[PDB]
RNA sequence: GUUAAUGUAGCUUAAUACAAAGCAAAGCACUGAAAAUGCUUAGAUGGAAUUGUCCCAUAAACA
RNA sequence: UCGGAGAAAAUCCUCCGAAUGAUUAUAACCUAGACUUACAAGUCAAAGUAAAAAUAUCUUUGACCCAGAUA
């Protein structure tokens, strides 16, 4: 009786939700399925905004609105890296590319694929872009002041599961200008096979201390051999981990498209493969000579062919 | 032809390949408890004494998309932390983040009294107009 | 009759297998486990059975549970026993059907 | 006391099903699924079968 | 002068990070009252270390 | 004969009830896998299809033969 009693449902709900998160000795569901200058500046603006009567009037008249672009730019500078890191880990980029190592993104990298001439499709984290839209190389811009920019097909390999294909890699990029990068790998369009799901493509940016000869990494131009596009980021960055530290991220998802047929035929010059999603066969207990109290259908579950046979006759 | 060598079985490792296809399992039990856990992605809206928040969380429990008045950029342009317009705005902020993240389908579980609340109705209007769907599609067996 | 636990914890269970019978709710459905009108518990997936304790939250609409839940003291909340099955197989895989 | 009665479909088909009603209340009439037409239609009481 | 001091907002040994947090408390509406519910209100790190003592503002008693 | 409570899985052991009734916005067809059980009878149910815009809750009888009723 000493303890007070919850007066509303919400109080119990929130307490229960917190209770679940805390560890417990008994078995539970989770086990199995699992500076000061700024502050002074910040306060001044808030008092100014509070003083503004027009803001108060608009709020109580429920007509106010907020500029999206300004918030987006502010979010990127202040705490965008923290949110950006979450997405990469959720999509498995860290575990599959760096074997579990984590690097916080810092440069608000920007990419967009030019569509025709009037418009250009942006490439955020987790966006969906068709292979046709990615036929040509995109426009890349970032605030710097060397660099290496890299492309991967994380899950598009057709023979070896671990390996991945390069689209193009520029090295020895000075400052922001990108035309000065060495074209180690010429650009190729995405080619995800039909019926094989969603593939994730990643944009990587590494800070370069001093220019390094990537002669071994360089691929011939033009190169249409898949045996040469295969590589591993983990070992690749191991040989350059002294002068290379990642600083950028951007990825998108793409499905099959008609252009993919052209890529496999015209330049890859091979027959395109087709994949289908197959479910495991249904489970049936072992067959019995006498199926007591089972319907006539019992015999159908164990037959292979649907057409009659006549044996010796 | 070297290029024509292909393994019999493809192995996509995308953590969201099956979920987007619609062929991934959703937990179907919890018939004596509220709320139902048969969702790929769920939206939780929390109202505190001084702040209002909203999260998108996967079944395992990891938050993927989050918007909160605690975020600095939001408040500096925000007159009041607890307003009907603020609920609309935080929803609009969340909506844009979801679309770029690619989370086009979601589910919401408003309690009866909370559902009647005008602010929540306004928030739903913000999400639906932005095009985030508040009911997931049925699984394909 | 013979009310009891048909399938004990740590046993491979196929889809449709009945796990428990009960006149009253001694156990509650959990993950991938359904309810029969007679209140029996069956498995909705192939996997391993597990018994675990967990917090109980009722539907808002039902009166009796809400009345009791709010009346509980601030210190703690009531618990219950839940049943879950852990799936043990991938639902499907991709295979090469044709080269065109 | 209660009486068992036969409800007949008014779709032109002969489909019927048996229901229960207390002898005190009026004759029953209901909506029900008609398999032959594959639609919901009215069923109207036509005859008495037995008293239970 | 020595103690004792009291030193993020009623409370918290919230926090120093990507926020000065959570809770208590307040107004109006909703008619038995209260509670619940919806819409609203007002706020603080004296200030450090170093944390899981100063430090001076302050400070009764010591004096 | 069947069901509920104690003894506690024995009894000619200690008790109460049942051979229904009320409300029903009307609850289809088809089908993996299981419980219960000497036999016979009795329970629960994914997916698919169909009507609609998913389950009616209260909670307990009788084989075969042989005669009925109508369409
Ligand atoms: Mg039998
Ligand atoms: Mg079904």
* R_g (Cα) of chain D, nearest Å: 11
Distance between Cα C35 and ligand 2 center (Å): 13
Say how far apart CA A228 and CA A186 lie, in whole Å: 12
Minimal Cβ distance to C75: which of A3, A7, A280? A3
Are A168 and A217 within 8 A, CB to CB?
A: no
| Measured CA distances, A177 to A144, A172, A207 (Å) | 9, 11, 14
Enumerate the β-bridge partners of residue D29. Answer: D44
Which parts of chain A fold into alpha helices (H)?
9-21, 29-32, 36-51, 53-60, 68-78, 80-90, 93-97, 226-229, 233-239, 258-262
A271 contacts chain B (CB < 8 A)? yes
Query: Which residues of A are less than 8 Å from C75 in CB distance?
Result: 3
Within 13 Å, how many C-alpha atoms sit on residue A174's CB side? 2
Enumerate the β-bridge partners of residue C12. Answer: C48
Gap from D2 CA to F39 C1', Å = 37
**Residue B29 to residue C94, Cβ atoms within 8 A:** no
**Residue B37 to residue C57, Cβ atoms within 8 A:** no
**Residue A66 to residue B71, Cβ atoms within 8 A:** no
Footprint of strand F on the protein (CB under 7 A): A 282-285, 292-293, 297, 300-301; B 141; C 1-2, 6, 14-18, 21, 34, 36-38, 40, 42, 44; D 1-2, 14, 19-20, 22, 24-25, 30-33, 35, 38-40, 52
Say how far apart CA B45 and CA B56 lie, in whole Å: 9
Distance between Cα A245 and ligand 2 center (Å): 55
DSSP code per residue over A18-56 = HHHHS--SS--HHHHT--HHHHHHHHHHHHHHHH-HHHH
Tell which phi-psi region holds residue C51, choosing left (phi > 0), alpha (psi between -120 and 50) or beta. beta
Say how far apart CA A273 and CA A258 lie, in whole Å: 13
Gap from A293 CA to F64 C1', Å = 20
User: Positive or negative CA dihedral for A9, A15, A16, A18?
Assistant: positive
Closest CA to B106 of B39, B21, B14: B39
Contacts of C99 (CB under 8 A, 6+ apart): A271, A272, A273, A274, B4, B6
Query: Which residues of A are less than 8 Å from C43 in CB distance?
Result: none
**Residue B79 to residue A49, Cβ atoms within 8 A:** yes
DSSP code per residue over A110-147 = EEEEEETTTEEEE--TTEE--TGGGSSPPEEE-----E
Distance between Cα A292 and ligand 1 center (Å): 8
Contacts of B141 (CB under 8 A, 6+ apart): none
Say how far apart CA A278 and CA C93 lie, in whole Å: 6
Query: Which nucleotide's C1' sits nearest to the alpha carbon of C6?
Result: F35
Write out the H or E segment, with its range, that includes residue B95. Answer: helix B84-101
Distance between Cα A305 and ligand 2 center (Å): 28
Distance between Cα C34 and ligand 2 center (Å): 12
Query: Which nucleotide's C1' sits nearest to the alpha carbon of C45?
Result: F46
Which bases along strand F come within 7 Å of a protein CB atom? 20-28, 31-37, 39-41, 43-48, 50-52, 55, 71
Chain B nearest CA to C33, separation (Å): 5
Chains B and D touch (3+ CB pairs under 8 A): no
Give the three-state DSSP class for A184.
Answer: strand
* R_g (Cα) of chain A, nearest Å: 29
**Residue A3 to residue C92, Cβ atoms within 8 A:** no
Enumerate the β-bridge partners of residue C13. Answer: C47
Chain A nearest CA to B125, separation (Å): 14
Chain A nearest CA to B137, separation (Å): 18
Are A255 and B14 within 8 A, CB to CB?
A: no
Six-digit token string for A86: 């979450």
Six-digit token string for A123: 């490439």
For chain D, give the residues followed by a break (C–N over 2.5 Å). none
CB burial of residue D27 (10 Å; 0-12, 13-18, 19+)? exposed
Chain B nearest CA to C13, separation (Å): 16
Chain C nearest CA to B87, separation (Å): 24
Closest A-chain CA to B81 = A59
**Residue A86 to residue B64, Cβ atoms within 8 A:** yes
Closest CA to A156 of A191, A204, A107: A191
Ligand index nearest the alpha carbon of residue A294: 1
B11 contacts chain C (CB < 8 A)? yes
* DSSP structural state of residue B140: P
Say how far apart CA A51 and CA A37 lie, in whole Å: 22
């Amino acid at each position: 009786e000493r303890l007070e009693k919850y007066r509303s449902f919400e109080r119990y709900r929130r307490r229960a939700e917190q209770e679940a998160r805390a560890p417990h000795w008994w078995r539970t569901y989770r086990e199995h399925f699992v500076r000061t200058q700024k502050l002074l500046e910040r306060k001044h603006f808030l008092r100014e905004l509070r003083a503004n009567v027009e803001e108060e009037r608009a709020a109580r008249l429920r007509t106010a609105s907020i500029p999206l672009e300004a918030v987006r730019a502010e979010w990127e500078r202040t705490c965008g890296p923290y949110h950006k890191q979450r997405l990469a880990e959720y999509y498995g980029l860290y575990r599959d590319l760096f074997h579990g190592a984590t690097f916080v993104p810092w440069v608000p990298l920007h990419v967009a694929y030019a569509v025709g001439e009037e418009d250009l499709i942006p490439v955020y984290h987790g966006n969906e872009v068709t292979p046709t839209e990615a036929s040509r190389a995109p426009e890349v811009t970032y605030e710097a002041d060397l660099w290496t920019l890299l492309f991967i097909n994380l899950d598009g390999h057709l023979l070896e599961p671990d390996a991945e294909y390069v689209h193009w890699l520029l090295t020895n990029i000075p400052s922001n200008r990108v035309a000065e990068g060495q074209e180690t790998c010429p650009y190729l369009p995405p080619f995800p096979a039909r019926g094989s799901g969603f593939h994730r493509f990643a944009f990587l940016l590494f800070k370069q201390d001093k220019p390094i000869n990537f002669s071994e990494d360089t691929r011939p131009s033009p190169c249409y051999q898949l045996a040469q596009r295969t590589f591993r980021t983990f070992d690749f960055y191991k040989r350059h981990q002294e002068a290379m530290t990642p600083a950028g991220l951007a990825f998108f998802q793409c499905r099959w498209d008609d252009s993919v047929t052209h890529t496999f035929h015209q330049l890859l010059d091979m027959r395109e493969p087709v994949f289908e999603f197959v479910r495991p066969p249904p489970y049936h207990p072992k067959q019995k000579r006498f199926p007591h109290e089972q319907p006539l259908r019992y015999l159908d579950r164990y037959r292979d062919s649907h057409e009659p046979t006549y044996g010796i006759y | 032809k070297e290029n024509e060598a292909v393994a019999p079985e493809f192995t996509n490792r995308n953590p969201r390949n099956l979920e987007l296809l619609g062929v991934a399992r959703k937990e179907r039990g919890w018939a004596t408890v509220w709320p139902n856990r048969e969702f790929w992605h769920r939206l939780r809206v929390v109202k505190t004494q001084h702040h209002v928040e909203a999260f998108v969380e996967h079944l395992n429990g990891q938050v993927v998309v989050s918007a909160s008045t605690r975020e600095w950029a939001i408040k500096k342009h925000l007159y009041s932390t607890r307003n009907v317009v603020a609920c609309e705005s935080i929803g609009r902020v969340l909506a844009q983040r979801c679309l770029e993240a690619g989370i086009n389908f979601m589910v919401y579980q408003p309690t009866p009294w909370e559902a009647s609340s005008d602010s929540i109705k306004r928030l739903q209007n913000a999400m639906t107009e932005s095009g985030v769907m508040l009911r997931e599609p049925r699984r394909i067996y | 009759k013979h009310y009891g636990i048909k399938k004990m914890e740590g046993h491979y269970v196929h889809a449709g297998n009945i796990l428990g019978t009960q006149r009253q709710f001694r156990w509650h459905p959990g993950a991938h486990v359904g309810l029969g009108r007679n209140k029996c518990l069956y498995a909705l997936e192939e996997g391993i059975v597990r018994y675990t304790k967990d917090v109980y939250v009722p539907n808002p609409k039902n009166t009796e549970a809400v009345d009791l839940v709010t009346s509980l003291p601030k210190g703690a909340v009531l618990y219950k026993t839940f049943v879950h099955v852990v799936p043990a197989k991938p639902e499907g895989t991709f295979k090469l059907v044709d080269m065109l | 006391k209660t009486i068992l009665v036969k409800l007949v479909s008014q779709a032109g088909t002969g489909f019927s099903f048996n229901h229960k009603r207390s002898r005190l209340r009026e004759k029953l009439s209901l909506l029900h699924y008609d398999p032959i037409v594959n639609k919901k239609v009215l069923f109207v009481e036509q005859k008495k079968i037995r008293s239970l």
